[PDB]
Amino acid sequence: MYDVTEWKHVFKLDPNKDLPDEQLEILCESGTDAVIIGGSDGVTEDNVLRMMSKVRRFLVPCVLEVSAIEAIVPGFDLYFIPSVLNSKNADWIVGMHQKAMKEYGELMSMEEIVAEGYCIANPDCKAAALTEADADLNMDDIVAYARVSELLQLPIFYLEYSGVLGDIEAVKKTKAVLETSTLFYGGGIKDAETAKQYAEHADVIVVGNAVYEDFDRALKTVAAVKGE
């Protein structure tokens, strides 16, 4: 019953960090379309489990973006499973996913799962290092990864720039080739202005790091794209 093609904004929270309960509550009731519990690396099941319990009470859909088999926790409304399409190591595309299925096939069949075709386009971030992504891409390299996602009919193509604003032109061209995939963009969105700019091309903008750096400023990204 969760339709990402109707979404416009999502906050991505890092279970490795701590947020005041007051802020976590404010983010869940902010009007964002989803609260995603992310991770990238070093995540632990206990932090994920505490966060699940803290966000589940709210009406907003809570999503667990799976980044480690040890950190799959029941209780979330949805599960996003990333596949790093430009990874140079099969583990981040399919390998870890096969081990998870082998180990938790049953737990996996009982949840709503959505695969995300990730394209990590910032060569200098923790995510690119970890996943051995060939992240130094020209725009047509990115557009081609988007075409690959559209061909596999991955519900989500996520252009990931991490802590930097990505080339807006690459967001506009990616969007132009996606006909079924929902385009998620994440990267340097810290306020109303940037939020509004990227929301012009992405189907969904992801605001994450900013919540920890300047909370009040990051909160305005919601009204910035859903407001009057």
Ligand X SMILES: CC(C)=CCC/C(C)=C/CC/C(C)=C/CSP(=O)(O)OP(=O)(O)O
Residue range at the interface with Cl ion (CB under 5 A); choices 36-44, 77-85, 106-114, 171-179 = 36-44
Q: Establish if 5 lies at the interface with a copy of itself (CB under 8 A).
A: no
Alpha helices in 110-166 (DSSP H): 126-130, 139-152
From the list 69, 130, 148, 223, which residue makes contact with a copy of itself (rule: CB under 8 A)? 148
Q: Establish if 165 lies at the interface with ligand X (CB under 6 A).
A: no
Rank residues 82 and 227 by Cβ distance to ligand X and give the closer one. 82
Q: Which amino acid is at 161?
A: Y
117 assigned ligand-binding residue: no
Give the C-alpha separation, 73 to 111, whole Å.
11
Tell me which residues in 111-140 interact with a copy of itself (CB under 8 A): 113, 115, 140
Q: Establish if 92 lies at the interface with ligand X (CB under 6 A).
A: yes
138 assigned ligand-binding residue: no
Burial annotation 110-134 (CB, 10 A radius, 16+ → b, else e): eeeebbbbbbbbbeebebbebbebe
Residue among 169, 173, 203, 176 at smallest CA distance from 186: 203
Enumerate the known binding-site residues: 12, 14, 40, 158-163, 188, 208-209
